[PDB]
């Protein structure tokens, strides 16, 4: 009903597609960062996932944080010892933007275990706002996933919580997911969820809402599938720990599919 | 920083920060400055500013107030806005005895709807459409101001802050205590405003959460499963409420005609799902004759 906004869902979908492009971090930014690596970014995101749990924050909040962190590191060089500080202020800002009850600064300080002073956190906040020019309403995979769920027939929440898990996983690995847009990652995450639990595919109704064929999403599907398979062996485990509990239907305990099927797109 | 802005006078305080009227010394432009202090203390930049800025940058529209600049010192934070000459209530009061010529009521509604449909089309709820937040210029334009209480929503929505909207313009679903509310809550508010321009008194000038509900019921009737499914399942709802029959609309929106009353009712529907959309309200026959008049006296 009006909570699915029947009169505006198109204008919204179009617009976020328009905005996801404009909010996309520069694809190969870590290579220009002298002191930090994609592995170090992998370590910081995981921490944020953990932070999101300690304070029962919206998954949405997590997703915006990573967006701010990514765009920040696209412009500003950051020493390893300060990476946590970027993250904290981002997590702080995304909280302020998205949470009904965002945690206080004191609490944000207290979790770095006094690596940084309150003064420093508030100052980084400002710096991040400057660097982003206050453009904090960035589209996330979540905002697309939520929209994609209304096409389900019928609505299955093992499918829902799995896609969440999968979309969340992609936040850990800059390589390769930086070359993918939120609408695309969400399209694969939803399809991969809708295959592991049910055996259905990326529904026709969405082919014409998005424009995404199962063909165009093939590159991203492969990477996701690979990441999904490699998940128990991945260094960062917080997301898997997160999605074990009854809340998200314990989807990270499920066994990923072996193959996915798929058409040879090119015919010789 | 503000070395190029001379403060003329203070104009108000509504929501976060204080607003000054200022003049750009170099360009000659008259502007409105929103100023935030810090200290604060704190906690950093307020979620309300963060929200207003981010959204208001995305939102360029003839019927949404224009944010011109952000001056971002360590100590103060300035928001530079276009200056509008007065708020709608002010205005509505000035015309307490004379009234507002239909064309004009019609124009102001149309524009507020155009503006609000843009908001929703871009996944923004204002959540504070009191007539102090609707600003008018001398050329007959009206604009949505103060997005301090705004938010960007997901599709579908989720539970957002309960403590929301000025009591008078606050939709029943929020009053009742539902876990979800959407675009319609903004429409309810414009509905109340629509009436407020017509009769120049608040439609539901309630003095508390329960009394507000009481007044809404006094005027629109006490709702049940037929008109709005599930109302009895709602949290802060009570069966011990009296049962009022719906008041025939001429009492009390007397001067309003055939079409306006159709629209008004549609704007003031109980069921959030039934309620008209802004987009759908723009097509309504009430607006077929619309023009852009100039506000009568020197405002
Ligand atoms: C939103 C409500 C706000 C809070 O008080 N008031 C208000 N009024 C404006 N202009 C109408 C107005 C109101 C009062 C005076 C005034 C003038 C002198 C002394 C006291 N008040 C002047 C203009 C105006 N323009 C732009 N913005 C903002 C920055 C977007 C405005 N915000």
């Amino acid at each position: 009903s009006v909570n699915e906004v029947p009169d505006y869902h198109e204008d919204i979908h179009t617009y976020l597609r328009e905005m996801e492009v404009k909010c996309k971090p520069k694809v190969g930014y870590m290579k220009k960062q002298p002191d930090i690596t994609n592995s170090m970014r992998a370590i910081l995101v995981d921490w944020l996932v953990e932070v999101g749990e300690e304070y029962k924050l919206q998954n949405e909040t997590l997703h915006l944080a990573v967006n701010y962190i990514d765009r920040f590191l696209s412009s500003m060089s950051v020493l390893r010892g300060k990476l946590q500080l970027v993250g904290t202020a981002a997590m702080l800002l995304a909280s302020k933007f998205e949470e009904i009850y965002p945690p206080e600064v004191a609490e944000f300080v207290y979790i770095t275990d006094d690596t940084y002073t309150k003064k420093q956190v508030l100052r980084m906040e400002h710096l991040v706002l400057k660097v982003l020019a206050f453009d904090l309403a960035a589209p996330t995979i979540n905002q697309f996933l939520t929209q994609y769920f209304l096409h389900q027939q019928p609505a299955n929440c093992k499918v829902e919580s799995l896609a969440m898990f999968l979309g969340e996983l992609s936040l850990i690995d800059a390589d390769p997911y930086l070359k993918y847009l939120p609408s695309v990652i969400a399209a694969a995450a939803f399809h991969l969820a809708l295959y592991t639990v049910t055996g259905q595919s990326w529904p026709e109704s969405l082919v014409q809402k998005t424009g995404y064929t199962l063909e165009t999403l093939k590159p991203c599907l492969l990477d996701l599938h690979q990441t999904y398979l490699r998940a128990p062996q991945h260094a960062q485990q917080s997301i898997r720990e997160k999605y074990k509990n009854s809340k998200y239907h314990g989807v990270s305990l499920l066994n990923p599919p072996e193959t996915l099927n798929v058409h040879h797109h090119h015919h010789h | 920083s503000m070395e190029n802005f001379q403060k003329v006078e203070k104009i108000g305080e509504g929501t976060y920060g204080v607003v000054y009227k200022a003049r750009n010394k170099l360009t000659g432009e008259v502007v409105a400055l929103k100023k935030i202090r810090l200290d604060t203390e704190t906690e950093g930049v307020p979620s309300t500013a963060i929200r207003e800025i981010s959204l208001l940058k995305e939102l360029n529209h003839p019927n949404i107030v224009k944010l011109l600049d952000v001056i971002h010192t360590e100590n103060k934070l300035y928001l530079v806005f276009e200056f509008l000459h007065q708020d709608l209530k002010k205005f509505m009061d000035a015309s307490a005895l004379t009234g507002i010529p239909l064309p004009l009521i019609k124009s102001y509604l149309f524009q507020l709807l155009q503006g609000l449909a843009f908001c929703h089309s871009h996944r923004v709820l204002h959540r504070d459409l009191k007539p102090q937040n609707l600003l008018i210029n001398t050329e007959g334009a009206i604009k949505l101001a103060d997005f301090g209480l705004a938010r960007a929503f997901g599709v579908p929505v989720r539970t957002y802050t309960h403590e929301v909207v000025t009591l008078w313009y606050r939709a029943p679903e929020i009053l009742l205590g539902c876990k979800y509310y959407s675009t319609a809550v903004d429409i309810w508010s414009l509905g109340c405003i629509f009436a407020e321009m017509v009769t120049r008194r608040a439609l539901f000038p309630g003095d508390s959460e329960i009394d507000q509900l009481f007044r809404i019921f006094r005027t629109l009737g006490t709702p049940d499963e037929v008109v709005w499914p599930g109302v009895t399942s709602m949290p802060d709802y009570k069966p011990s409420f009296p049962k009022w029959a719906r008041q025939d609309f001429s009492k009390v929106v007397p001067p309003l005609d055939e079409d306006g009353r159709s629209l008004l009712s549609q704007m003031l529907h109980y069921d959030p799902n039934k309620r008209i959309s802004a987009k759908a309200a723009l097509a309504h026959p009430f607006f077929q004759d619309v023009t852009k008049p100039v506000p009568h006296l020197r405002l």
Side-chain angles (χ1 to χ4, degrees), chain B residues 129-174:
Chain B
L129 292 174
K130 46 158 172 164
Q132 290 88 342
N133 287 348
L134 326 177
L135 305 170
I136 66 185
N137 70 18
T138 47
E139 355 302 305
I142 192 169
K143 295 174 187 210
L144 307 163
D146 211 314
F147 283 64
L149 248 68
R151 92 130 71 203
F153 60 87
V155 180
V157 309
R158 70 168 208 290
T159 309
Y160 303 124
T161 317
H162 162 253
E163 295 73 50
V164 101
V165 193
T166 320
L167 171 66
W168 287 6
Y169 312 97
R170 193 198 288 183
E173 59 267 38
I174 305 178

Side-chain angles (χ1 to χ4, degrees), chain A residues 167-260:
Chain A
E168 218 146 306
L169 283 171
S170 80
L171 294 172
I172 286 291
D173 306 304
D175 180 36
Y177 303 104
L178 243 39
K179 68 207 189 197
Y180 301 113
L181 282 169
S183 59
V184 183
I185 294 174
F190 176 63
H191 170 86
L192 187 45
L194 199 60
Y195 191 61
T196 309
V197 194
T198 68
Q200 309 174 278
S201 309
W202 161 261
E204 180 46 48
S205 65
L206 276 174
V207 182
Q208 40 202 219
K209 202 216 181 82
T210 71
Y212 303 155
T213 62
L214 207 52
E215 173 181 82
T216 58
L217 305 173
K218 189 184 160 83
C220 190
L221 234 324
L222 292 156
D223 288 351
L224 217 43
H225 176 68
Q226 265 298 124
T227 311
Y228 187 15
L229 293 167
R230 286 186 168 192
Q233 294 88 242
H234 199 298
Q236 279 65 40
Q237 284 295 319
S238 299
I239 294 170
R240 278 192 68 247
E241 288 284 61
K242 179 166 173 167
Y243 285 79
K244 268 170 191 160
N245 301 298
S246 58
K247 165 76 164 292
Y248 307 99
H249 300 71
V251 292
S252 65
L253 287 178
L254 268 166
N255 302 113
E258 282 200 300
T259 60
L260 294 176

Side-chain angles (χ1 to χ4, degrees), chain B residues 9-14 19 21 32-34 65 81-87 132-133 135 145-146:
Chain B
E9 61 212 10
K10 178 168 150 182
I11 74 179
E13 215 131 304
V19 187
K21 180 179 172 162
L33 300 183
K34 254 209 190 77
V65 63
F81 287 101
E82 57 172 337
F83 166 84
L84 285 105
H85 304 59
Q86 84 176 26
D87 68 70
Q132 290 88 342
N133 287 348
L135 305 170
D146 211 314

